[PDB]
């Protein structure tokens, strides 16, 4: 040889940034791509002068052993010190180098010994001729360069100036990290799963130079893209650890989260109320100890800003490894032909990619990467060899669906692909459940990217919907992430998922039944309009309105027979309540899985989100149910456009179809979450048994938010893709960024399917979700979760019509929040309880009365009770079983003795005559009912009371009624809040609102 190299890796470093002197190959934002001791590792080096493969083991930063140095296949496990651990080479060679955590199988030595197209694509090339002993070279550093830039030496070394005092190089002057910071954030290199960083003297690495090379040697940066991805993963996890442990801190479980989220709600309300002044803070400061609250915010906001901007830059640094192929280009050496390595491979793909789609800019980078490179979604496709399989990439393009009719042969296509793939890819069958739990979790690590790709394709669909233009299903299915076909062909063998296609007979039957459903809905709309006209001209006492009501009841019964069948046609599964109608495609399943999926979907559509268990149902049936509804949604909506109906009926009809789609999408999601949690024990067991010693490799802090295959998250994120404000505010809050929060807030000012499956038990499910960022991911949980519910509060409070009225229930809330000036006033409810109570206090039924220059409008807001929650899923139950009991209140006054008050029921009239005046989120309308008769020798005054039983099908599926008691005046412009009351003994009837009966 003529030179010695030494193994460094690129790594995260606390500021020891060589980029001022050297060109960073991939320029990390969050921590400088400084040089570091190498993780416990296998190192491989190909010499272009000979073609031989070298193999090295790394322990504690340095070469432990050399264990092959050979040109040929031998054995998959190697356990000898073959010779000199040093890296020594002729200075004329080009080397190709790569870092690995596992011994490579002989199939992987063969993959880069023999073929240069794989070798030069996967392994990092270093040109020894380019290097210079006084400037360095490509990935090659001089002794003085390493002394300057090796962070483990440099980090805590006391640098010295020309007068012998401490010099502070730019990683020192570490910026006065405040006593507000988490105790572990005080410590450097917090990604300590296990602790690997240590203060080092370069003497220990010069001890690795063979003395003759002490003048000649250089330091080599091994592009340890796996080790960097693990460091960034464990660092993201540890910043989630800071977020969770701080949020959970304070005097009670979740006390600090409670305090901060309530402080940020109070600050947002303050900022909005102030911003309404130039177009009032005393009302808050009388209640809230503002100097304490704002000092707490001023301390914790710099923490949250630092933590979020750090996580954002970790996202950017990770997905610079998922645009440049550096991850898959490193993870190429996994070899499913050894089952232990198949497990270690899924575990290391999980460790590197876990929560990698932490945020939208990450999800979009990984998505665009998979859209360019969809083959990597097959298990270990980067390992096949990938480039020998570049010829079969043409077969995958030939397997590229000719639209949905591909699915009609899906079992044949799966067998044909297996005929391509047999021995070439992992067979995910017969493997123990711990290993296939790993396999699914690994494929799920990329899955929030597929969630965004599904979301963008559903965006293309919902655009076509808003444009009222029939989408080409063949286009849509091709545009879907070609990951999806690759997983669905796996589900076709794993689950027995056997798609039939609706025959032209079935398609024609369902097209006729859609023509029925739509002509009946048009008849219903006409009948409702006529009924309203009659009520306007003849009142609710007229018989003609009762004849129209009988017609409405007829058509409603017909719809309630047809729409179960329409929902089963739209269902993933053959189980009609039964000739069968179908459109698009449908799953045939083994009868156990079929019956479980049928009962589960029936429960979900009927609200029973719990006891909708899916014990034996896998993620494969998840995906199959999803794409079966994608196809049947597209095909039904194309059928509707083939009817070309009233555009005014398109929107309710599309909405309701999207409810039933969303309910089986939610079944796909709840299958995914149940498979995730039921496998979670097997996953933890696999990790603890036989994940790599090189990390504790824990189940990610966000796994229960990012490991489910996302169909309901991606569906909803597509449905509100435009509605950025929720994600903007919740992102800025999780940012703590005060001016970003103020911007999001002022720009904003200027269920059993979705809610019930995306909401979860909050300790596991909010303090974890705070590490999520970006508009779409944060907007999902903003629309549904408890911090999201507080945003649904902010959407109501601070608006002018709310500011116009008595905040007293909310003022009592405030003065019972943790920031009350008297602790004795504080009622230290847990944040879940404060969220419930605040929601109940803002999503009170909240009445308004308005006058026009002869006529008055009396209305009753139901904040968050969208009509989409009142509307009945095609077959199913209403999510909000809104039940306006109506009472009239009569009073007479006397010169002596106490005045009298009496209640009367009127409930039947208000159900017979209330109306909708906004679909979401905050109106319902009630007629100006006539007063009661007077009394002789005196006078009568009347109040109205609308005992609005709001009721929501809770996670239990139970009739969780909330008997609010709004009391209102008939003839004065007023806003009338509500709070529970003792009722006047015996209840009235409680008529149930079904909004299909309601004019809109």
From TrEMBL:
Listed A to Z, the keywords are: Coiled coil
Q: Where on the tree of life does the source sit, at the highest rank?
A: Bacteria
The UniProt record lists the keyword Repeat: no
The record's section on InterPro entries has:
VasX_N
- Membrane-spanning parts: none
Q: Does the keyword DNA damage apply?
A: no
The residue stretches assigned to a coiled coil in this entry are: 507-537
Where is each Toxin VasX N-terminal region domain found? 1-131
Q: Which named protein is this? A: Toxin VasX N-terminal region domain-containing protein
Q: Which taxonomic lineage is given here?
A: Bacteria, Pseudomonadati, Pseudomonadota, Gammaproteobacteria, Pseudomonadales
């Amino acid at each position: 040889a003529k030179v010695q190299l030494l193994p460094l890796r690129y790594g995260l470093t606390e500021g020891v940034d060589p980029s001022a002197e050297l060109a960073m190959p991939f320029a990390l934002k969050s921590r400088p791509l400084g040089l570091r001791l190498v993780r416990n590792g296998y190192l491989y080096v190909i010499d272009g002068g000979t073609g031989k493969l070298h193999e090295y083991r790394i322990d504690k930063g340095a070469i432990d052993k050399l264990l092959w140095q050979d040109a040929e296949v031998r054995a998959d496990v190697r356990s000898r010190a073959v010779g000199e651990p040093q890296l020594v080479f002729p200075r004329t060679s080009v080397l190709y180098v790569a870092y690995s955590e596992l011994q490579w199988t002989a199939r992987k030595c063969m993959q880069v010994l023999a073929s240069p197209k794989d070798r030069e694509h996967f392994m990092q090339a270093v040109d020894l001729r380019r290097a210079d002993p006084q400037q360095g070279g490509p990935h090659l550093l001089t002794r003085r360069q390493a002394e300057t830039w090796l962070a483990e030496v440099v980090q805590n070394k006391v640098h010295r100036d020309e007068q012998g005092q401490q010099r502070f190089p730019p990683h020192q002057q570490r910026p006065a990290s405040p006593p507000a910071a988490h105790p572990d954030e005080r410590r450097d290199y917090v990604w300590e799963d296990p602790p690997l960083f240590r203060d080092t003297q370069l003497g220990e690495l010069t001890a690795q130079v063979l003395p003759q090379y002490e003048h000649d040697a250089l330091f080599l940066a091994l592009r340890d893209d796996i080790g960097v991805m693990r460091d960034l993963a464990a660092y993201q996890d540890e910043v989630v650890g800071w977020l969770e442990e701080w949020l959970q801190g304070g005097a009670q479980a979740g006390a600090n989260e409670r305090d901060y989220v309530i402080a940020c709600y109070i600050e947002s309300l303050t900022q909005i109320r102030a911003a309404e002044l130039p177009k009032g803070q005393r009302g808050i400061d009388d209640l809230i100890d503002r100097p304490a609250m704002d000092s707490f915010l001023a301390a914790n906001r710099p923490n949250l800003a630092r933590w979020n901007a750090l996580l954002e830059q970790i996202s950017a640094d990770r997905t610079q490894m998922l645009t440049e192929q550096r991850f898959h280009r490193a993870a190429w050496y996994y070899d499913f032909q050894q089952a232990e390595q198949l497990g270690l491979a899924f575990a290391t793909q999980y460790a590197c990619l876990k929560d990698i789609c932490r945020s939208d800019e990450a999800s979009e980078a990984v998505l665009a990467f998979l859209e360019e490179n969809p083959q990597y979604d097959r298990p270990l496709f980067q390992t096949l060899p990938l480039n020998t399989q570049a010829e079969l990439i043409a077969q995958y393009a030939q397997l590229g669906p000719p639209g949905h009719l591909w699915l009609s042969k899906l079992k044949e296509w799966a067998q044909q692909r297996d005929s391509l793939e047999l021995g070439k890819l992992p067979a995910l069958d017969g493997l123990p459940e711990a290993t296939r739990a790993l396999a699914d979790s690994a494929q799920a690590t990329l899955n929030p990217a597929l969630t965004l790709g599904i979301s963008r394709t559903m965006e293309g669909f919902f655009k076509s919907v808003g444009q009222q233009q029939a989408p080409d299903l063949d286009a849509l299915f091709r545009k879907l992430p070609k990951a999806l076909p690759g997983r669905l062909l796996d589900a076709a063998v794993r689950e027995g998922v056997t798609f039939t296609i609706a025959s032209e007979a079935e398609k024609a039957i369902l097209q006729a039944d859609l023509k029925e459903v739509l002509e009946q809905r048009a008849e219903l709309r006409r009948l409702v309009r006529q009924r309203k006209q009659v009520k306007s001209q003849a009142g609710h006492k007229s018989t003609d309105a009762r004849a129209l009501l009988a017609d409405i009841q007829r058509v409603r019964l017909q719809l309630n027979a047809l729409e179960p069948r329409l929902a089963a046609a739209l269902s993933p599964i053959a189980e009609l309540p039964d000739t069968p109608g179908r459109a698009g495609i449908t799953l045939i399943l083994p009868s156990a899985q079929l019956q479980e999926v049928a009962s589960g979907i029936r429960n979900l559509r009927n609200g029973y989100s719990s006891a909708a268990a899916f014990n034996k149902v896998g993620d494969g049936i998840g995906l199959a149910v999803f794409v079966a509804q994608f196809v049947n949604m597209v095909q039904v909506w194309r059928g509707v456009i083939a009817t070309s109906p009233d555009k005014r009926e398109l929107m309710p009809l599309a909405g309701s179809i999207f409810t039933t789609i969303s309910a089986g999408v939610a079944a796909a999601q709840a299958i995914a979450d149940t498979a995730l949690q039921a496998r979670s024990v097997q996953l933890a067991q696999g990790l603890q048994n036989h994940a790599v010693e090189v990390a504790h490799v824990q189940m990610g802090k966000l796994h229960l938010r990012l490991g489910f295959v996302g169909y309901a998250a991606g569906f909803f994120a597509a449905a509100v893709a435009t509605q950025t404000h929720y994600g903007e505010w919740l992102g800025a809050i999780r940012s703590g960024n005060a001016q970003a929060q103020q911007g999001a807030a002022l720009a904003m000012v200027g269920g059993y399917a979705l809610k019930g499956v995306l909401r979860a038990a909050t300790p596991a499910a909010e303090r974890t979700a705070w590490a999520l960022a970006g508009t779409r991911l944060s907007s999902i949980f903003a629309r549904f979760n408890i911090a999201g519910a507080i945003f649904t509060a902010l959407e109501l409070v601070g608006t002018y019509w709310y500011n116009r009225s008595n905040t007293t229930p909310h003022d009592d809330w405030l003065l019972s929040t943790p920031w009350s000036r008297d602790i004795g006033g504080r009622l230290n409810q847990s944040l879940e309880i404060y969220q419930q109570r605040l929601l109940g206090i803002v999503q009170t039924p909240r009445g308004e009365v308005k006058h026009a220059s002869a006529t008055a409008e009396i209305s009753l807001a139901l904040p968050g009770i969208s009509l989409g929650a009142l509307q009945q899923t095609l077959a199913g139950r209403p999510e909000v079983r809104l039940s306006l009991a109506a009472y009239r209140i009569r009073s007479v006054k006397y010169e002596r003795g106490s005045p009298m008050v009496r209640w009367f029921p009127v409930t039947e009239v208000v159900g017979d005559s209330l109306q909708v005046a906004s679909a979401e989120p905050l109106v319902l309308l009630v007629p100006r009912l006539a007063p009661l008769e007077g009394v002789t020798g005196g006078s009568v005054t009347e109040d109205l009371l609308l005992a609005v039983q709001i009721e929501r099908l809770n996670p239990q599926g139970q009739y969780h009624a909330d008997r609010h008691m709004v009391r209102l005046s008939p003839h004065s412009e007023g806003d009338y809040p509500a709070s529970p009351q003792r009722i006047q003994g015996q209840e009235a009837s409680w008529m149930l609102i079904d909004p299909r009966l309601l004019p809109d």
